[PDB]
Amino acid sequence: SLLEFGKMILEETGKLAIPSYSSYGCYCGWGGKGTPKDATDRCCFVHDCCYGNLPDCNPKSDRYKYKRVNGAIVCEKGTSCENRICECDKAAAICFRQNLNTYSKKYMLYPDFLCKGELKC
């Protein structure tokens, strides 16, 4: 759930997921449309697509477990859903870190009306 994912985000970026990545661009929040603003925003886009391909699950609420081994996130072994949700989160957390380089403050608190158009996964 948001609890584990947020821990990963902090671990990988040194930033608190909320409010750093909770109102960022067009896809780092609840919104779901328009062209991602930058690399960080695309990370959220991909994350939505991953969760979007877990129909048989409950991404935001299902609690899962994981641990770090040699500095790299390692998803433990839970139910099918737990491992898949954990992987989706891991990929995003790492994506955020890889692109901290281009994280822009100007995309924080981004107005949703500035995002229009469906971008298929």
């Binding site: 948001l2 584990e4 994912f5 990963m8 985000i9 608190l16 997921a17 909320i18 780092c28 929040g29």
Partner: peptide, 5 residues
């Protein structure tokens, strides 16, 4: 922890 809502 905080998450991207």
């Amino acid at each position: 922890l905080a998450i991207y809502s």
